[PDB]
Amino acid sequence: PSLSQPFRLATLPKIASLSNFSLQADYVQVADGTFNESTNNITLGISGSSISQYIINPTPKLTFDYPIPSTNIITACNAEKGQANKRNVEIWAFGLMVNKGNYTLNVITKALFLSQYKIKAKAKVMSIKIDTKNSLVIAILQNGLIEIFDFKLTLLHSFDISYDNLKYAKWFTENGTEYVFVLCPLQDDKVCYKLLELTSSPIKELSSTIIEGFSFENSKLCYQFGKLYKLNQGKIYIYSLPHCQLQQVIEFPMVDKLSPGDDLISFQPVSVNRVLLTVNNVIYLLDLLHCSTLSQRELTHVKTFQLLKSAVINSEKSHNSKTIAIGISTKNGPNPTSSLEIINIDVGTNTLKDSLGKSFQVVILKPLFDDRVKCNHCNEVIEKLSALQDNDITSFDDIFFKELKIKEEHYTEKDRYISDPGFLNKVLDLIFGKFSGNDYPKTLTFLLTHPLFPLSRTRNLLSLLRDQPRLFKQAIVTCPNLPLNELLEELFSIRNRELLLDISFRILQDFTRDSIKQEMKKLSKLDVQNFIEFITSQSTQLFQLLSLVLDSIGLFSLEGALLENLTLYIDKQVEIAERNTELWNLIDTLPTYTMEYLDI
Amino acid sequence: GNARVTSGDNFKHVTTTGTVTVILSQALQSNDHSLLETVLNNRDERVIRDTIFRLKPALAVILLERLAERIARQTHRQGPLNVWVKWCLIIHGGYLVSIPNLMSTLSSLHSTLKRRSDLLPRLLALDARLDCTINKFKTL
Amino acid sequence: MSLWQLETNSQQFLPRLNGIIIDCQVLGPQGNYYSLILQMTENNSNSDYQFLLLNASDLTSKLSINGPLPVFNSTIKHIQQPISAMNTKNSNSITSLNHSKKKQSRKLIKSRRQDFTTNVEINPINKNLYFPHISAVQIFDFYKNEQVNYQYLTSGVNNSMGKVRFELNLQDPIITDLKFTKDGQWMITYEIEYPPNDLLSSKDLTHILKFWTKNDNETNWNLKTKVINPHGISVPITKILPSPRSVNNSQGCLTADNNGGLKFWSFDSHESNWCLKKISLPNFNHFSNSVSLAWSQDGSLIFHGFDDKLQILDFDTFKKFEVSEFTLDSEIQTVKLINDTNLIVATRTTLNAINLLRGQVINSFDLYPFVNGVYKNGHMDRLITCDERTGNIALVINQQLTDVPTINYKSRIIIFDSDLSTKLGNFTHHEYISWIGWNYDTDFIFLDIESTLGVVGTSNSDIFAEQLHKL
Amino acid sequence: STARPRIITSKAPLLPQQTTPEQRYWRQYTSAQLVKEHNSVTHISFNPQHPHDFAVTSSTRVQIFSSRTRQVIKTFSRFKDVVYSASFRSDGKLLCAGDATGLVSVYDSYNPRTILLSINASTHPTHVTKFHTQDNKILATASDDRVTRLWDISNAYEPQLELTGATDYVRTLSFIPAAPHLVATGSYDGLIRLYDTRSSGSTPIYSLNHDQPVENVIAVSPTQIVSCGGNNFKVWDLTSNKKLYERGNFNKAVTCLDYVENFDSPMQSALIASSLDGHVKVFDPLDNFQVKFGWKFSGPVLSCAVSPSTAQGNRHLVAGLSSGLLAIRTKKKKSNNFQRMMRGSEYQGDQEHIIHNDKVRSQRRMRAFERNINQFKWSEALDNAFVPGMAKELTLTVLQELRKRGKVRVALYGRDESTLEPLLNWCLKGIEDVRSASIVADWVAVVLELYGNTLESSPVLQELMIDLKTKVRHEIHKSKEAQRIEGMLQLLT
RNA sequence: UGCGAAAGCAGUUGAAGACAAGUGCUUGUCGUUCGUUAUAAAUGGCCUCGUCAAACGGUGGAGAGAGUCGCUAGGUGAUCGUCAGAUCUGCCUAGUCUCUAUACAGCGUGUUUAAUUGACAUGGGUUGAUGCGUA
C-alpha cells in the first residue's frame, strides 16, 4: 500500500464563505453517482461559484460548468447518467439555500439543456438520490421529510421520519434493493437512527433506534459496508447496520495529542475495513481490522488537506487495489490559496502481510503457579556497573556474576531469568565504554554465549574481537546472528586453517545456499582465486563451500589454467573418495582315497 | 487400488556438413516421434555438437524434455543420449539461466537423474562385496 | 483359534483374529457361543485387550468389545508383554520376564524422561476420534463410547499371517502423523516403514505419505495418492499442517522436515490427484527434530520455527518476508496463533505471547521446573492446544512422591485467555493426561493413561393389564 | 475374522509420459487395412444413418465402403471428369457430388444406376456440394466461379440465392447448427465470410480474418466455428467475433478437419485435423484444444473423417492420401420336460417379503506364487518368481514380499548351483533397471554370504559373478554420470 | 542404556542363593534375590461359504509376442595364415525399422467420479492312474 503524490484538479475561487478553511469542505459538494472506481469524471458543487464537471484522465480538464450566484450555498448535489423519455441523458440535481429564507430544488437534464426545473423546498436539502431507472429524484430535507419527485420536479410521494433537525443521511444498495438510514440528534446526547427501505408506499421503515452517548459536534462520520465509522476525540467507534450497534472502539494515540481547535481532521473510507485519515498536512492509510497504519504521507507544501470524497473499492470482489480520492489543499503563506487535489491510493490486498509490524498502538518471567512433587533488579545491576571506574575488570565481573548469581562463564539453561533483552543491551554498552583495547571482562564471554545476544551489536563484532584469538573463536562458535557478510569477508581473508574450517561450518549451518551464493557474487574475483589456491595445496563442509564458490563465480569468470589445476585436484580426491568407500564396506562385511597316520 | 504413486522430486507443477538441424527443429515442433528418432540415431559427437550449436535456443528446452522422457523409459539409452543432454546444457547455458522457471520445465530430468544418483551408495556396497569374493576364489 | 477334534485328532480353524488369543471359553448350555480375549501385542506401550463373543454356528463375531486404543510413547505402570518362546520386541522369554519387570520399575522411578503423550485426532464433519494405532487407525465414537472402525493404513505383514518366533522381531510400518483438512473430506497420513534386520538395506528407513478421501456416508477411507520418500530419501516428515480454509478451499497441506524444508501440496482437479505445488530448499546441514509450524487464518503468511529460530514466510513467494527472524532462548516446541493478532510460542524453558502487530512479547511464563527434559521434542505440540475463538490451554503433569518418586502422577490443566493475560480456569486430575486437544465446539477433550476421555468445557382393568403382561 | 489381503503388486513412482485415458481409447483403432486408389482421394464423408457407410471421392469415381465389411458395395462412375465431393443428406437417402465440368449430380444412395437430379451449377469446376443439415430440400454448391449458389432440389433451374463477394477460390462451406439461416464460407483470400440466407444476402454479414488460405471450415458447436488454414487451425466465436484459441503443432498445411461429439470415449468431443505432413491428430475441445493422440501415414493426408456419434457398431477412422492410398482403422465393438422340472432359477424374488443374500463375490483366481506365500512355501515361491514368460513386475513383488516377510535367508538354504542359476540370471538382468536395483543388491549379498564355499568349487557360478561384476560396474559409471549432470544443472540454476 | 539426526557420540553386560548333570571338583540352568541408566531346534504354518467364459471403466507398464542378414554403435569366437588378411556369406548386446486383440500387470463394475453380462442339476456311481499331450 502506498499514497501517490496529489495532483491539482482546480483552484477554488476566493469567496468569503470559502475563506474559512475549517468549514471550507462543507461548502464543496461531490456527486456520488459520477465519482466511483470506474468513472473518469468528477462533478463538484462549489458554493457561490458553480457546479462543475471535470475529467480526471489523461489530464484534468473542465467539461461543464453551471454558474450559481455568490449568495447561494450548495447543500446537496448529485448527478447520474441515464435514459429519459429514449435518449441518453445526464441528470443534475442540486439544492441551494439563500439566507435560509428560501430553499431551492433544481433539476437539470443534459443531452449526452434539454430541460431545467426549480421548486421551493420546505427545508434545507441535505441528500439527493437520482434513480435513472425510474426517473425519480429523492431529496432528504433537514425537517425529516423524504420527498419523491419525477424529473419534472412534480412531487409524487412524501414521507416524514417524525423527527426534525436531521444531521446525517446516506444511501447504500444491498442485494439489488436501495436503502437509506438517517441519524437525528436528540437532547442529552441521544440520537435517533432510522433505517428506510425504498421499494404501496415506496418507502418502508425497517429499523428505528435511539443511541445514547453519541455526540455530533466534535464527531466525524462516514459509512462503509454496513458499518458506520465515528471519529471522536481520537477514538473510532464502529457501529454496524441494520441496528447500528456498537461493535468496536479503536483508540488512535496520534490524535490524542492534538490540541482541540487547531488541528483539521477529515475522515473518509477507501476500502473494506480501511479508511483514510488526514491531520493537517499529513495523510494516513489505516487498516481498522488489524489496527495498523498502512501508509503515511506528509504534504509539506500545503498547510492543511481536507478530504471531500474517495472512490471505494469492493476489495472482496475487486481485483483492483488502486483508487482515487479528492480533497481540498491549502497552501502556506500570508495569502493562502485553496486548491482541489486528487490523490491516487493503493489500498493493498487487505491482508495481514500488509499490516504486520505497522501497529499505531504503543518483560519479567512469572511463575506458572502461585502455589510432595518432584522437580526435574536489572536497573540496580546496571547502576552498580555504571558507577565502576573505567578499565576495572575485576569489579565488573564480580558485580555481574555475584549479583545475578551466575555460576558458569557460559550461558546455561539455569540463567533464563537474565534473558530480558534490554538489560543485555545496556550491559553491552557498559562493557564497550568501560573497556577498550586488549582486555575485556569475562562478562562478554558469558554474553556471547547468550542466545539472545542483540542484533544491534552483532555488526562489526568480529572486527572488535579481531584482536583476541580466544574471544574471536568464541564468537564464531556460539555468537548468534553473526552477519553472513562479515563471516564471508573474514573467511577468505584468514590464512589460519583452523579458523577457516570452523567458519565454513558456521556459515553452512546457519545459512541456506541461495543466500550465501549471492554474497559470494559481490566479492572480488581475486579472493575466490586466492581461496581456490588454498584448496589445491570436516573437510566435507569445506568442499561443499567450494562448490558454492564455483557456482557464484559462474561460467564466464573462471579461467582455464586455474581450472586444470582444479581439474587434477578433484580427480585425485574422487579416486581417494571412492577408495575409502570399498574399505568402509569391507569392514562392515570327500576324497575317495586319502593318506593319514593313526594316533596310537 | 488405482491410486497414483509418486515421489518427492516430481517438480512438475511448481559449422560442418552432415548437420541435422533442419530435420531436428521440425521434429520437435511437430512432436513427430519417428522423425525425431532418426535424428537421435546418429552418434558422431562432431555431428551432435554442430546440431545443437545452430538449434534455436527456444527449441532446446523442449529437446531436453524430449530426451528426458526417452532416458527415463529406456535405461539402456542413457549413454548415447547423455552426450546430447551434456551438449545442450553446455551450448545453451546462458539462455537456460534466463528462464522464469526451470524445475517445472525440466522436472523429468531431475526425476530421472535423482533416481540414478540415489542408487550409487547401494551399488558401491554391492561392488565391494563382489570384489571380496571374486578376489577370494581367483586367488584360490 | 484352533478347535481340536479329539475323536479323530483333526482340527478346524478360525484364523486372522485381530490379536493373539489370551483366553478361550465355551459359554452356553449347548456351546452356542465362544468367548475370546485378544491382546493386540502390536501396541507394546499398553495392553490393549479386546473381548470377542463368537456364534458357534458360523464362527462370526456376535459381539466385539474394546476400549479406546491409543499408543503411548513409552510403557506405563506395570505393563508386561506376554510370554513367548523367545525374547523379542513384542514378547518376553521365560527368563526375561522378571528382569524386564525390574528394569521397568527402575525406569519409571529413576529415569527423567517421562513422556507418554499420544497422538490423536478429531474428525471435523463427524467428530469421531481417530487413534493412530501401530499400522492402523482406530475410529472411536466417544458420544456413544464405542469403536466404529479399525482400518489398516499401511502395507506390511499386518493380518496376512500370525508372526511367531523370529518373525515377531519384524516391525510393521508406524503411522507417525495423521491429520485432516479443515473441510474434513481429505485424510493425510505419514508412515515410516522399517526395513528387516540383517540385510544390506537394513538401515534405510522409508518415509511414506498418503492422501485418502471418503464421502460422509461411507465408513472406509480410500487411498487416493501415495508419495514415496517425500523431501528426498531417508529425510523424515516431522510435521504436517493442513491448510486453512482460504487457500485452495482447504484442499492443501504443508509438510516440514528436520532440515528446514517446507513442501506445500494441493489437490489439482485437472490431475485429479495431489501434487507438490511449492517447495523450499532444506539444504543447510543443520539438523533438529524440534520444528513448529503455524498458518494464519487468511493464508497469506506462515510461521516456521526451526531449532531456536522462528521465520515468517510469505505464502505467495514461499520465502522470508521483506522482523521475520525471531531468536528464542532455546529450541521451539510449539508455535500457534490463538487469534490472528497473537502468536503463542513455547520453548523448552518457557512459553511466551507475542503481538505480530507490535512485535513485542507481552507475557512470559516459566515452564522449566515442570518441563525440563521429561518430554522429547515435538510432544509439547500435542500437550498444548488452542481454541479458535476463546483462548488456549497448557497441560502440565508431574510425579507425586512421598519420602523417592512413585509411579502415580497428577495432572493440571490451565485455561489461558488470549495473550495469556489471565487464567480463566485451573483444574487438577489424578492421572497422567496424555493428550488434550480442542474439539471444534467450545469444549476440550483430554485423554488419560487410563484411556478415559474426559472433557473440559463451559381399577380392575389395570390389574388385568398386569396379569396379561405377566403371562 | 477377516479375509486374507491380496498381495499388492509393486508400483514404482510414475515416470513421465504415462498412458492417458484418451490415448488408451484411441489406441484401440488397431486393425489397419491400406487400400490403393487410382488418384488422390480428395473428400471423405460418412452416412449419418445406420449402417453409416462412408463415401470416398477419387479420380472420376465415388466408392461406398460397408461399415462392417470394409469393402466397396456401390460404385458411381458415371462422372466424366474428376469428382470433388460425396456428402450425404441428413436423412442419408441421397448423395451429392461435383465435377470439374461443373455439373452437380444427386444420386439415390445405394442405387447408383438412378440419377434423381442433374444441375449445371457453373461452367467452372464445382468443388464443394453440401446439403443443409437443418433443412433437407436446400442444397448448397461452391464453384471456382467464386459464387456459392444455394440450390433447391424442387427447383433446379435457378438458384434460390447466390452468395458472392469472395476474391479467390471458395473450397469450404459450413452450415452453423441451430442457426439454419446462417451460412459460413471460406476462401483462399484468407477471409471466412458469414452470410444470412433469411436476409437478401449476396454480401457477407461480417468477415473473419484467418491470414492464410482456408482449406476447411467446420462449425464445432452452435456458437463456435473452427477453421483450418495454412499451418494452423483457429477456433472462432461468432457472438464476440474473435478467435478463442489457435494451435500450431502442425508442420505442413492442414487440409481437412472433422468433428465428433458424444461418443463412448472418455473424451466427450474430438477434433481430428489432417496435416499434409502425414499426420492426423486429435484435439480436445473441452481442454482448450490440446493434443491427445496422433497417427503418421506414408504420404500427405488430404482428407480425414471419423464415424458419426451414433455409430451403433464398430467405429472407423478413415484418412485419405494424395498418393491414392486410403487408410482405415477400426475399433471393433435342454428339453421342455427338463425345463419344467427346474423352472425356479430365473426368479429374483421380486414378489417376496424378505430378500436375503449371503453369497460372497467371486475373487480373481490367485497365481501360483501367491498360493505358495499364503501356504508358507517360501522356497517354492522363489522358484515361481523366475519362470519363463513371467512379467517383470510380478517377479519383483515375490522378491519384495519375501524380504518384507523377513524370509530371505530361509528361501535360499536348500539350494545348489543347479537351482541358484535362475536367480542370478534374473539378477543379471534386474540389476540394470532402477526399480529392482536395490532389491537385487539385497539378494545378491545374501547368496554370497551363504554360498561362499560352494562358489569356489563350482565354475559356472564363478562366471555368473564375473559377468555380474562387469554390469554392476557399468551401472556405477551410469550413476556417476547422472550425478555429474545433476551437479551440472545446479550450476545453471 | 543416556543424548541426538536418521548418521552417530559416550557407557554397560556385576554379585549372591538354589537345582540338575558328569566326576568334595567341573559345566549348564533359574514361574529366587541384591545391584547398575543398563542362536533356535518336540516333524511343529492360518477354515468353509461358486466356479468358468466373455465384456466394460480407471490405474501402471521394464510393455507380451513375432519379423527385418534394413540401418547405427559396440563386444567377440572357429580354422588357416606369407600378419596383410582370408573363409565360417560367424555369433552376441543395445538402439532403430515393420506388425499384432495393449496383445502385459493390477483395482473395480453389491454404487460409484466412471463402469456387466452369460453358462452350469455346485449331486451319486463306473472305467482309466501304466491318466492325457508331447520328444
Side-chain angles (χ1 to χ4, degrees), chain A residues 357 363-376 411 413-414 416-417 419 451-452 455 481 508-514 541 544, chain C residues 283-286 298 300-301 309 321 325 327-329 348-350 356-358 361-366 368-374 396 398-402 405 410 412 414 416 423 426:
Chain A
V363 175
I364 308 294
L365 275 293
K366 324 184 198 156
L368 187 64
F369 281 64
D370 58 356
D371 192 0
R372 73 284 190 192
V373 71
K374 178 187 318 300
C375 60
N376 57 13
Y411 173 87
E413 287 199 342
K414 322 192 201 173
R416 55 222 196 271
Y417 304 116
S419 305
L452 281 73
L455 295 174
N481 286 317
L508 187 153
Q509 171 187 251
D510 304 349
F511 305 101
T512 66
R513 313 200 40 261
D514 62 358
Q541 294 85 13
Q544 169 162 355
Chain C
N283 203 287
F284 63 91
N285 310 139
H286 191 173
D298 60 338
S300 73
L301 56 81
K309 185 166 316 300
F321 174 73
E325 57 203 50
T327 301
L328 277 293
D329 58 1
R348 175 175 281 294
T349 62
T350 67
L356 312 179
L357 314 190
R358 282 145 87 191
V361 65
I362 304 94
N363 301 320
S364 54
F365 269 110
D366 186 9
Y368 181 99
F370 318 92
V371 178
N372 181 11
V374 303
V396 189
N398 58 7
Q399 283 187 357
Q400 283 181 353
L401 79 167
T402 48
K410 158 182 80 195
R412 314 181 91 171
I414 299 91
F416 271 107
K423 301 177 162 147
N426 188 323

Side-chain angles (χ1 to χ4, degrees), chain C residues 82-93:
Chain C
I83 293 179
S84 173
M86 293 177 71
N87 182 3
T88 72
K89 291 174 71 175
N90 302 354
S91 74
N92 294 350
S93 66

Side-chain angles (χ1 to χ4, degrees), chain D residues 318-336:
Chain D
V318 182
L321 310 180
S322 68
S323 56
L325 275 295
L326 174 140
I328 302 294
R329 316 186 63 87
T330 304
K331 194 251 166 174
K332 300 173 187 179
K333 177 178 185 200
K334 294 95 189 194
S335 65
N336 264 27

Side-chain angles (χ1 to χ4, degrees), chain D residues 354-369:
Chain D
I354 306 172
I355 304 309
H356 169 89
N357 64 73
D358 282 333
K359 312 205 76 60
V360 160
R361 195 161 261 127
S362 179
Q363 69 156 31
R364 58 177 278 288
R365 205 210 303 96
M366 64 183 73
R367 307 205 173 237
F369 79 92

Side-chain angles (χ1 to χ4, degrees), chain C residues 128-190:
Chain C
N128 281 10
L129 205 64
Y130 281 60
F131 285 15
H133 197 273
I134 296 184
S135 86
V137 67
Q138 187 213 15
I139 297 169
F140 189 92
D141 211 356
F142 64 95
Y143 288 161
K144 198 187 299 184
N145 194 18
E146 310 299 347
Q147 66 86 28
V148 309
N149 202 26
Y150 191 74
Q151 187 176 358
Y152 282 122
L153 299 174
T154 69
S155 182
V157 173
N158 299 295
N159 50 304
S160 310
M161 63 150 188
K163 290 151 161 202
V164 297
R165 291 184 185 276
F166 287 88
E167 302 172 355
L168 198 57
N169 283 317
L170 272 57
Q171 173 53 267
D172 297 344
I174 302 177
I175 294 92
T176 298
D177 293 330
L178 160 62
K179 288 203 174 183
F180 291 107
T181 55
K182 298 289 183 69
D183 75 343
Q185 305 200 345
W186 283 86
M187 183 177 176
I188 304 186
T189 75
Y190 165 53

Side-chain angles (χ1 to χ4, degrees), chain A residues 395-444:
Chain A
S395 73
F396 196 98
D397 278 334
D398 280 345
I399 284 159
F400 184 86
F401 284 102
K402 189 182 177 166
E403 291 278 329
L404 299 173
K405 215 161 80 153
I406 301 297
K407 301 182 175 177
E408 299 291 337
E409 192 216 10
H410 65 278
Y411 173 87
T412 68
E413 287 199 342
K414 322 192 201 173
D415 292 330
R416 55 222 196 271
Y417 304 116
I418 295 90
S419 305
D420 190 312
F423 167 76
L424 279 76
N425 211 307
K426 314 212 211 283
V427 168
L428 290 167
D429 311 332
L430 275 294
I431 289 180
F432 182 76
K434 270 69 187 166
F435 307 104
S436 49
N438 277 351
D439 309 308
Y440 281 103
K442 305 319 152 291
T443 301
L444 183 59

